[PDB]
């Protein structure tokens, strides 16, 4: 029953403000970093920032500073995200998450609809695969330090799940079929016999230097 309940789908006019919330259960946020991620309608993940709720210190991707403000209230166990001067480019799903070795958890997400630096390269952008084929996706950076790279799998309409930690270690409960390799700047995710449960979008995330950054993603299709 470990969880992050995200509070509220919203519809607002250009120029308005919205403040979202993320209340946790099963753990105290004061004991963690609380991260916020943005994902545009047919686009990829973007790290906004994190907050350390015990002392309120925050860290952002400089492009969001001034537009998005992370706040946290430990008595309520709740972290917040305030977005200002909303535009067409802000229409997205916003997740909160707790990232920790083998303890990643994400909220269900919250849709905001506006109505009127390390580089991660993912190859292929999209691909068609078959029923028992060997699939290898890659992720190339600009010196990730030793292996601070996560592999996430996202299905249409769901929060991303972590499959691999520290580049090559399988998450708990992940099928044998999946595996990760590399160190340095060059990483890969391989699925030996593609199973039918594997159709989704795969993302790599570097957490080696701050601002945490995501590859553009790989949509696998059966």
């Amino acid at each position: 029953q470990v969880k992050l309940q995200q509070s509220g789908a919203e519809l607002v006019k250009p120029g308005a403000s919205v403040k979202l919330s993320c209340t946790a259960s099963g753990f105290n946020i004061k004991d963690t970093y609380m991260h916020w991620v943005k994902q545009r309608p047919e686009q990829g993940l973007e790290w906004i920032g994190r907050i350390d709720p015990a002392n309120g210190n925050t860290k952002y991707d400089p492009k969001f500073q001034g537009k998005a403000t992370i706040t946290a209230d430990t008595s309520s166990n709740t972290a917040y995200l305030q977005l200002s001067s909303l535009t067409s480019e802000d229409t997205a799903v916003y997740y909160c998450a707790r990232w920790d070795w083998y303890f990643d958890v994400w909220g269900q997400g919250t849709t905001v609809t506006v109505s009127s630096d390390i580089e991660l390269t993912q190859s292929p952008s999209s691909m068609y695969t078959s029923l028992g084929e060997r699939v290898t996706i890659t992720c190339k950076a600009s010196q990730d330090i030793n292996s601070y790279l996560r592999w996430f799998q996202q299905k249409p309409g769901k929060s991303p799940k972590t499959l691999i930690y520290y580049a090559t270690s399988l998450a708990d409960g992940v099928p044998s079929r999946f595996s990760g390799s590399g160190s340095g700047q060059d990483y890969s995710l391989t699925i030996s016999s593609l199973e039918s449960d594997d159709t989704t979008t795969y993302y790599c995330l570097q957490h080696g230097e701050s601002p945490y950054t995501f590859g553009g993603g790989t949509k696998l299709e059966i």
């Binding site: 963690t32 002392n55 990232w99 920790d100 070795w101 957490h207």
Partner: peptide, 22 residues
């Protein structure tokens, strides 16, 4: 070093959290 780089800082060291942090 690895332990501290997962995205959650030094929070896995519980005694640190209870006796040192802040």
């Amino acid at each position: 070093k690895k332990i501290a780089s997962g995205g959650n800082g030094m929070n896995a060291w519980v005694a640190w959290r209870n006796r040192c942090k802040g």
